[PDB]
Swiss-Prot record, chain A:
Natural source organism: Mycobacterium tuberculosis (strain CDC 1551 / Oshkosh)
Xref: PANTHER family: TRYPTOPHAN SYNTHASE, TRYPTOPHAN SYNTHASE-RELATED
Source organism phylogeny: Bacteria, Bacillati, Actinomycetota, Actinomycetes, Mycobacteriales
Entry's EC annotation: 4.2.1.20
Function: The beta subunit is responsible for the synthesis of L-tryptophan from indole and L-serine.
Protein name: Tryptophan synthase beta chain
Family: Belongs to the TrpB family.
Any matching Pfam family: PALP
Name of the gene this protein is made from: trpB
Length: 316, 315
């Protein structure tokens, strides 16, 4: 899984990142670089119809659910290319299966003036003229890989040989679900972006900081993102609603509480939530009854309201 | 196509809408209503790497290319639902095929507080049926139609008797790429929200009205909506750029498009529709014309997909 040859290079990366993590700049820069570019920042939607089932509080939904697939990978990949610039590297390489991650990188590469080489297997090249051409309009060099079996793994190594030999100037940009993932802190940190955008937008739309920021927690990572900008705010409660059934308060929400919250979003708001998020809307709702009038509750609508629908329409 | 029995009723919508058209109160209420919902307002991106290839004017790109279609149908459907509410109609009906239009229609009625009934063909009731659930989850009655051919035609006819039947409180709402399009003043006015929104965004981001607002003319009726809102800003220049009222018209050569296109790709990592590329080409020109600092705004409208082919060959 990782050629020990990659160890000094991954280490130099991990090393430069930490240095970056020392303060708000790197994310600050990232935030500015995504603005208006490809879906960031996502909208923070005030659900006024929901107020009447929430103790006369004001619920704001932080629409993560409106991101589409890879404008989102672009926003992820830009921070990786912004790390190359800060590290001083001037070229970026990556591998690409069906070509989607190559198109993302090629995009950031070119947004930031970085040269860009993407490795892709000869099998992948012949049947994907379109992403290859995207990539080529965007400026990268697309290297059709003719060794081993001309598949994905194949690209991966040629890229590893490339990255080993060219580490002075070259940042390797990971992202294929089957490719390497050597840098988990990074990937968590980028999601704090969600928090920073909610903090700004709440200050904009309500004129103060919220009385509570809230997410469904038990789901992988990337709901948790909403919190971190808010940790410092002594006035702000942070509540993580856990999928029960029969610095942050964890609290539980039952299969029922979440379904009532669900159908109630469908009807009052016209938005169909992820089940995951219904738990959180349910709790935002608990919270506002419990906090009363003009309470300001920001809620993360995380993720993909595509059939949990299956499930929801059974529930009724 | 449209049954005559409908005419007393089409007229009334027509009278009412003609009323709210004219007025400032409508498109601001629809602005509020659609704010932060399904993709509106759309982003205004300062494309600062174009500046160098544009006399170092400042080029803002109105990003209609980021619109997921579908979040477009809701946005379009919200306006009829908004109009229905302002007639004092309380329930809304429509028809659908695979049932995309009915999903949107249901969506805007949940949001707006309207009872909703959607007509669908028995058969598409059968081949397509979470949409039917989607709808019901949104709280609309679905009338799955079991009358003659059990498909869209019959699904339009039920809808129309219901309509003629309940005129007094029922609005009907279209968009379905086949059923009726009785209101074409409407479809065209609702693109106006694009200029509306641009006009609030470019003052926030650039401190002032733009020097020029620029778009692609002889294609995709979706481009021109960026102008209306600047009409009463005399000394915002409006430039419609054509493939070769207050608005000037100006041609762009096949060649000039593709320099802008290529460049939009290499500098901003944005891949446009060829149509959009005509506007960018026009914005570059204008920049050099207008000078260091001009502020110029461009509708990048249209899907940066399958112009891709065309573009790759071209190089």
């Amino acid at each position: 899984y990782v050629p020990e040859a990659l160890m000094a290079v991954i280490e130099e990366v991990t090393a430069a990142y930490q240095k970056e993590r020392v303060s708000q700049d790197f994310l600050d820069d990232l935030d500015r670089l995504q603005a208006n570019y490809a879906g960031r920042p996502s909208p923070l939607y005030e659900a006024t119809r929901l107020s009447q089932h929430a103790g006369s509080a004001r619920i704001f939904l932080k629409r993560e659910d409106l991101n589409h697939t890879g404008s989102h990978k672009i926003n992820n990949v830009l921070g990786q290319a912004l790390l190359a610039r800060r590290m001083g590297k001037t070229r970026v390489i990556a591998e690409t299966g069906a070509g989607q991650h190559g198109v993302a990188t090629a995009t950031a590469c070119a947004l930031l003036g970085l040269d860009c080489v993407i490795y892709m297997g000869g099998i992948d090249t012949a049947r994907q003229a379109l992403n290859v051409a995207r990539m080529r309009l965007l400026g990268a060099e697309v290297v059709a890989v003719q060794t081993g079996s001309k598949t994905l793994k194949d690209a991966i190594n040629e890229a590893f040989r490339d990255w080993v030999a060219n580490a002075d100037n070259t940042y390797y940009c990971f992202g294929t679900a089957a490719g390497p993932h050597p840098f988990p802190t990074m990937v968590r940190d980028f999601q704090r972006i969600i928090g920073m955008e909610a903090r700004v937008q709440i200050q904009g739309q309500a004129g103060r900081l919220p009385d509570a920021v809230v997410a469904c927690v038990g789901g992988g990572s990337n709901a948790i993102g909403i919190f971190h900008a808010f940790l410092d705010d002594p006035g702000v409660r942070l509540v993580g609603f856990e999928a029960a059934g029969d610095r942050v308060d964890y609290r539980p929400i039952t299969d029922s509480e979440a379904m009532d919250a669900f159908g109630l979003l469908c009807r009052m708001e016209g938005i169909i939530p992820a089940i995951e998020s219904a738990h959180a809307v349910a709790g935002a709702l608990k919270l506002g009854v419990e906090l009363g009038r003009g309470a300001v509750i920001v809620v993360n609508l995380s993720g993909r309201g595509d059939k949990d629908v299956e499930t929801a329409a059974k529930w009724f």
